[model samples]
Target chain A: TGLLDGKVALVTGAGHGIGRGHALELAKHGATVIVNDLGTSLGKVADEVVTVIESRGGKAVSDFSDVGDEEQVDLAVERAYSQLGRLDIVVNNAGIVRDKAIWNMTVDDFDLVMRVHVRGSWLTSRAVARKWRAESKESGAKVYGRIINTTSGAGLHGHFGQTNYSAAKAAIVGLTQTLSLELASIGATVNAISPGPIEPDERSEDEFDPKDPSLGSPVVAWLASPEAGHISGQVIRAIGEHLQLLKGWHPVASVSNGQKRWDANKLGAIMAADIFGTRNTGLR
Target chain B: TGLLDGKVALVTGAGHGIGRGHALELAKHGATVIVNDLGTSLSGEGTGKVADEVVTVIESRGGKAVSDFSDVGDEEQVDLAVERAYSQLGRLDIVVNNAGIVRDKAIWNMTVDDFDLVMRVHVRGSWLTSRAVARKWRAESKESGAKVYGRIINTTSGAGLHGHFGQTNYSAAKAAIVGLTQTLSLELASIGATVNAISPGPIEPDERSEDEFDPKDPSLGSPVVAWLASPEAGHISGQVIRAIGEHLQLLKGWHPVASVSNGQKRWDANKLGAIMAADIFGTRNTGLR
Candidate 1:
């Protein structure tokens, strides 16, 4: 028996890249995987992942659905339960990028990116949460559900020429954190992973070799396990061989005039001395 | 002369609450104010004449002001609002993207419209307004061969920073503002503009005994807005300041708390799990385990 024996998992965008890697890794640990992807390329990519899993004596099925759409997401969740008999893990890894500067970015550019990344994650998570909440209520037992969202360094640090992508990813951080708290009462955990770039040695000609993108899969697999029940509302940065826990916005310094509104003229001096000190102003 | 003398500022959703406070304070500092409000309720319904009411209050206080009813989320409306600022108020210098509506619900109960509407108003609204003003600032700077002083103050929240239960939609939109502020700060810096955000903490009524002031007063943080909009604050940008009554805090975004690495091989599930609990969570059991 493997770490995830008897558990069933659903991974979106599983047709390519990190999503495919996650599907393989989860199955390696004995999960019955649902390989979900959009119906592009005739849905062959998702079917290929499923075939590879089956070849390795693992269980998986291909699913094509637009994660951003509510009806599609709901039907996909229903399929998972009907086909797999049980659903325990969800990996929200679907995304698309429209990189451009703020000035050149069109309304569609911004709206589409937000819709795919932020809205897609929210819809999938909500559907699963609803299912798990009902299950817990009927059984009168805790449902150990796990949700792993994909974020990026761009989102955390705000990269130039990617305002739309960065904003959507950062918004995922907030979504992950809030959902963690909301789902905790039902014995579910929510977390995000900001996967780092692959190392040189891992980038062989076989870029599509499901194993090539499995660098961050270990962290994702570990987080999905029951062992990580205590780790909710946290962002883990998995890069190369390192896994770092990230802490979101927190106060570094503060100042105030006792019971008095801040005077604009005096505010700068106080801020310079007390809040900023010798540090250069603005984000570095 | 006051700190904002000769400056013109636009504060969206200025008809009520914190937006109203920002409008009053900016005008008090000698800036010509444009009080833009759709006059909608907290849930973004039923438009009223609230912007006009705010303009009257500003004018009655001997402050120069005008009212504009436009949805900050719409590209066309935002462009028109910026055009009106230049045409009527002389020039636009500061923009406070303060318009927002909250539809609080747990993830299980939140509808598609709930998520879409909250995001449209907060995230899309901020981006549209910033894009409109930045275009104007860039054009004027290019024409004059001199950098213009521009300030964009966005409103974020504790819910955005740390995430609050039953606020997934609202929190996501607010957090998106931080990324927008950070990117805009870098993009606009060359053209002599700065971008920042304000995160207001909960104002508990019981905590007012020692301070002997109205803790619920939404305007308590408005002075910080006025201060940031002034010429003296040119050095600061890409920062989030949390105002809790008279107290102010400088907040930093996500940073590495702790890390574990194996150096050569990728981490195994068992090994990483053991390390994460010890190195990250320490001895304090989170009880979920």
Candidate 2:
């Protein structure tokens, strides 16, 4: 039995990519797993992770579905609690990217992205929330739940091709913060991990570059543990060992009269002056 | 020449309500106007603000119908700009989308009633009034002889519509307002809209209610427009304000642990840190960035 021995963990979008990596880590870290995948091919990742755990003795079961579908999200999450008796972690790691320019982007891309990451996150969370409510009445003690959402660097600094992905990922940030704030009293915490450049995994077409700060398997295993009880409502960006947090940010300085309100036409060059090193006169 | 004289302006949702207020205000301040209205009772509101003064100040006989139409959003902003320039004062000036808040509801209660109101008025207004103009100018700017103008603008504010406010649906709406401004200016250089936003200045919210003030005044009016509203004010674009008055501007940002765990202004840091700490609380577990 490990630190998460009795705890149940659910990971969505576990079919591939970083989601698969998280599934492996959670089972290894000792949570009874609900490794959910949308397709058959990716079971290799989950089965492989559980095999190592089962070798040393840990429990994990795999479920399959398109979590972007709300009904599928319901079944998988409900099945987990019924099997494990308690759910302590939900890693909403499944998301997809169909890259397109802002204009060329399609509604299907936006809808699918929103359905899973938005509605899926909300429904899956509400599922756990219901269970948590029941657990409270039944057990009558303080308990904890986690919702780790996966956001990305593309989401942070808009990549040319990933508008749908970014909007969806960015929504995760909002959803996480809002949920964390709402559920703070109930001991449930929500957060989103905005990964920068993870080194190329075995499957990526690109070459793996490790020295560049954000390129490796992040130690999210540690953050996902029950011990991390205090933090919530944050956007944690990890670039390998180089980890940073993106705050509710602003462009800080503007020298102007604090006393009287002026019109935008009045301050000809002051409001959007070329003060920063970045400026343009529209010429090459 | 009044501050906006000879300036052809387009104020959407101008048929009635707040859009009407903004339209009439712009016209009063002196502008050849293109009042775009769906004439849909201001997104399902009232019929119209009496055009008593609009005729006096803006129109001599019929005024400039320089531009009038509800579907400006779909019409490529360049064509609209041409219509304003040719039909009105032969120049495009200010553009404001005072078309918003037709519905008030949460995301759950948000039907096409809660959601579409935000999208149609705020998003569509922006797409029509601002982005279309910017896109038009951006395209024109590519021509050697064509000129890109400097009077691009939009009406952004607090709530989800902008960064400075709290409600989620509103936040989504408002934040998008800032998002519209930020992205537009980045690519389009020949002309920049003096994009500006105004939120409710900090107030008691309710004076007649709580023990704090049985007669609390929300201080409905805030006069904090020195840097942004001015033409010289071109330095900043993307911002989420806490409050905007003569003095204070609670900026939206964060202090990294690397900076503060060492401690500088721990008082300010701690007070702010407490909130940061609150944000960071479940993050350690949930993996938020």
Candidate 3:
């Protein structure tokens, strides 16, 4: 028997790339999958992923809707529950790239990134949160729920030319941290994966497949499992071959004059010394 | 001599609250201050009284000052405001992006309007102003033999730095500011500019001082700004500094704390649980705030 026998998961942006891989992997482990994609190829790619699942003796379906729209994604999630018995996992992987430097980028580019990546993730997660809350009330027991968001290294480290993408991704990290705390009461864990470069050039032993974007699928699958219920509000970076848990920003070292603030003359020496890493003795 | 003896600074949201404090302190240290405040109340209703009030206070104390009333979020308005600084005050040296508004709500309860408004004001507004000033600084440095140093100090909140209950929009915008600071620090370094973030907590004593100069006092929260904008802080950039009561700290940036990789080019989707078993406990405890 597979690890996720009897489970149901809805994977967005499954039309291509990593989301497609995540859908295949989840179904392989015994979960019935609902593959959602919004693309010209939505007619073929999502169906192809589902057909592969069924050929492997797994159950599957396809959905074409805007993941960021309230009415659309909510309806999709509702169908996932009504048709599949229960909703257990949500992998938010739908995204678009509008790569432009801060100076050359337009406001529309900025707005679209925020809408599709940040707002869409919020819309889908909010719907599931409501359902999870209701499930707890209806059964008089805490039920399990999982929400996985897609982020990028650009969000964590701030890319040189991707201001719009970086802002949205960083905002998503904040949303994950905040939602992790808010949803902990109902046993639904929220986390994010800030992926590194997805090279389409090389594949090596000990190195994640460069052309295939499934390197992060394992982490997404692990995070969706019952075993991962304890880890919430975390951002994991799968850069190159290394998977690292990122410590979101926190204070390391500080200086205080007898006064409330500091002056340039006094602060200059401290700033120049680069004493922050060493003096971070207080609460992080 | 004042720390900023020849500098000209434009402080946004200087009509009231912490912005007003920043303007007053900057002027105290020999800055030719242009106090640009929309003069709007916290709920956004306003006359130009408070911004003009700040200018009056600075000018009365033998300091040079002016007031501008332009919406910080509008690109044209920001350009107009920055141009006014350059034309009226000679050279623009410092920018304190402290203008912000709060609309608190959880994700379910929040509207796109609330999220959009907060982000535009803080993120977009900060960008326009920085871009405007950066172009001027870049041109001036190319034309003059002496290097032109510029400082951009952004204001972040505890709610933004650390997630706060019912403040998803504010926190998101704040986190965006931190990311913006990180990137601008890299780009603007070539122009001799430093970018940083400040998070203030629990204002204390509620007193303003005159003539008394103990540059080491933590109560004013001004020295940190002055020091950060100083030439000595040339080597420091892309850092978050916190001022809470009597404490100041430069925060530690995020780094990798766990790893799971096989010798193969791809992970077998089923093996991650085991791969992450040992390292999860050690890395899971990192503080997010």
Candidate 4:
């Protein structure tokens, strides 16, 4: 039996790259998938994914709706419940990158990236969450709700020339963590996955090639399963065969002046000695 | 003898709360302050003359200051605000992006407008101001072939660092600031400018309720901002400094805590779930406690 048997999943940006891979892998595991995409190749790519899933004896439907639009996202979620009988897993893997230095980056570029990644993810999650909460309340039974958001190393480590992308991804992490708390009463688990480069030492086996974008999809499928209900508000890094748990922002060093407000001149020396220490270099 | 003498600073949303305290403290340190506030309430409704009041207080306290009622989220307003700082104050050296609005709601109860508005004010506002300043600083640096003394201090919150319930919109926007801060730090490094964020802890409830000292003094964290804007903090960039009253702490972002692998094969749900429950979380709890 498949791990995700009878589960209905929606994977945004399923037209290409890692999102497409997630759609395929979720389908392979017996989850009926809603392959969502946008733009000129919208139906084309979603249709292709549906065809592939069908060829493999898995059921899938194509959805051509903009994930960021609230009305469209709400309609899509409603359609899923109507057609599939139940909706369970959501993989918010849709994203666009606008790599440019802050100086060269346009306001439009920044806003667009945030709209697609942060707003899109939030809208879709909220729609599904509204449905799940209502259903769970009416039936007095905990519904299976798994939301997996896509973050990145850029989100965590602030990559160069990716101000917009980095900010958007980081916001996703916050969204994931907050939603985890909000949706816990309904037995929903919200988590994120940051896909990093496959190390040279790690290699893939089976049908997947090493460093393939699809390598991370198995992890997504696993997270979307009922077994992962216990793990909420966590970030996992997936690189080929390895997976790492990530901790969010935490204090590493601290100092106090015992009721006295720090003088600007003296605070520098105190910070250098206590906070920065011997490694006075900038934050890593 | 002030540390910030000869500097010109713009403090957005400086009409009330922590932003007001920052404006007062920066002005007291001999910096010509441009108090920029949209004069909106906490819920971003109904404008007032709050910025003018802050300006009056600064002037009465024997400090040089001006007021600007520009919306930080607007591109044209931000550009004009930056231009005003240069034109009126002779030079713009520091920018404190402290503008914010709260629309707290459960995800299901929150409307799209609520989400978009919070993001626009906090995230887009910060980015636009930073962009305007960076353009000016870069040009000035290029013209003179000398490093500019530019400082950008973004205001985040504990909710941003650690997620808060019923604040997905605010938390997301605030967390986005950290990413923007880090990126701007590196981008401004070559020009010798510094960018950082300050995460202020909850205000103390009462004078007698504190552990050791009173944290309710609204201006408690402003000196740290002043210090960071000075040349002495040039070595520090891309860092988040948490100010809990008189105490300060350095914050670091996500890092690997634990890891597991299934050799060269793909991991199955059952096996990985077991590992997560036992090794990663060390508990079978369904949610983070």
**Candidate 1 lDDT for residue B89:** 71
- The lowest-lDDT stretch of 10 consecutive residues in candidate 4 chain B is B202-211
**CAPRI-style class, candidate 1:** incorrect
Candidate 4 per-residue lDDT, tens place, B1-289, comes to 6888999999988887788878888888899999887664444333447677778788988998988889889999999989988887788999999999999999999999999999999999999999999999999999999998999999889899888999999999999999999999999999989999998654312222223555666667888998998878888999999987768898888998877667889888846755686467643323343
Please write out the lDDT profile of model 4 over residues A1-284, one tens digit for every residue: 99999999999998777888889889999999999987445248788778878987888999998988889999999999998987799999888888989999999999999999999999989998999999899999888899999999999889999999999999998898889878877888888988755321123335556567877888999999977888777899998778888776668998888989889988777777779896364564
Native contacts kept, each candidate: 0.00, 0.41, 0.09, 0.18
Tens-digit lDDT string for candidate 1 (A107-208):
899999999899999998999999999999999988879999999999999999899999999999989878986887788888999885542223553454
Look at candidate 1 and tell me the lDDT of residue B264.
82
Docking class of 4: incorrect
lDDT of every model, 2 decimals: 0.85, 0.58, 0.79, 0.85
Ranking by DockQ: 2, 4, 3, 1
DockQ of each: 0.03, 0.17, 0.08, 0.10
lDDT measured at residue A255 in model 1 versus the true structure, 0 to 100: 72
Off by over 4 Å in 4: A39-43, A197-208, A279-284, B1-289
Clashing pairs in 1: none
TM-score of chain A of 1: 0.91
